[PDB]
Design a protein around this ligand. Structure first.
Ligand SMILES: [Cl-]
Length: 299
């Protein structure tokens, strides 16, 4: 009977290391951006991650018990898919168990990079969740754009007919790994002034969307939080933008690598309540990103 449902899409690049004891902020959209700083539990939790070194059943344990400590409800996993260290998981309120149908998972390798995806039906309405890791490196904007198109065609979630038209609501999140077309100096000035707008005019992802090359007719909430990459581990005061190392020196300008985009159909409405990132979770050089939405469901 529920006309509306709240969905949580969380994306985090764990950075080849396990998570910490506490990850409440992430779950509850606490931190910076369009944030939620009662704590009422979401109808569905959907977790995407990119360099998650925790085992697949181990990892899903943490999610289940992290939600139990928070909500006091046994969220039950509907589906889960892994592709090396790229992993996604879809959990749901016990009561909503017998509304999920036609659940499907799939993966696509574009080494080590690609997409992991789940789709399913909630009553009448259909959903799609793609989680991905794309080609890294400031100048590799063409290869990412390829990655998208390959994931858009090759992902198996009516399948041998269309692509990003299959689902009522398609969310697409993860480490899209798109950078800023700017020199470190300005980037850092604009970050210290908390003036992200001039940097977003120049963000690669936005530039390719604006050139109608990738993510056609996709929507994204307006970013008002600092670039999620690349931090120094152990705090969030310091971008790790030019460390020297025996494995080479790497010149990474801070970027909004981590993103949540969606595409719905008309007359089927969906508002976005939260879209931000943490500031307390400091085990990875990425900061985890969250996004919460209210979504229309029918019989
Ligand atoms: Cl890499």
């Amino acid at each position: 009977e529920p006309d509306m449902i709240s969905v949580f899409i969380g994306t985090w690049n764990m950075g080849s290391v396990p998570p910490p004891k506490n990850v409440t902020s992430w779950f509850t959209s606490k931190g910076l951006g369009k944030t939620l700083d009662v704590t009422i539990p979401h109808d569905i939790y959907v977790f995407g991650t990119q360099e998650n070194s925790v085992g697949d059943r181990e990892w899903l344990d943490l999610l289940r018990g992290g939600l139990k400590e928070l909500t006091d409800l046994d969220y039950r996993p509907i589906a889960m898919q892994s592709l090396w260290n790229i992993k996604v998981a879809v959990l749901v309120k016990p009561e909503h168990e017998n509304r999920i149908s036609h659940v499907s998972t799939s993966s696509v390798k574009t080494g080590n990079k690609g997409a992991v995806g789940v789709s399913f039906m909630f009553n009448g309405t259909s959903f799609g969740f793609v989680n991905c890791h794309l080609t890294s490196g400031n100048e590799k904007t063409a290869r990412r754009n390829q990655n998208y198109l390959d994931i858009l065609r090759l992902l198996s979630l009516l399948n041998a007919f269309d692509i990003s038209l299959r689902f009522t609501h398609l969310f697409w999140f993860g480490d899209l790994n798109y950078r800023l077309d700017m020199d470190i100096q300005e980037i850092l000035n604009y970050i210290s002034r908390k003036e992200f707008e001039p940097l977003l005019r120049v963000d690669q992802l936005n530039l390719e969307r604006e050139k109608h090359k990738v993510f056609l007719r996709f929507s994204e909430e307006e970013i008002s939080f600092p670039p999620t990459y690349r931090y120094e581990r152990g705090s969030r005061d310091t971008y790790a933008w030019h460390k020297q190392k025996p494995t080479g020196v790497r010149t990474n300008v801070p970027s909004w690598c981590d993103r949540i985009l969606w595409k719905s159909y008309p007359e089927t409405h969906i508002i976005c309540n939260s879209y931000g990132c943490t500031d307390d979770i400091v085990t990875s050089d990425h900061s985890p990103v969250f996004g919460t939405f209210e979504v229309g469901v029918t019989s």
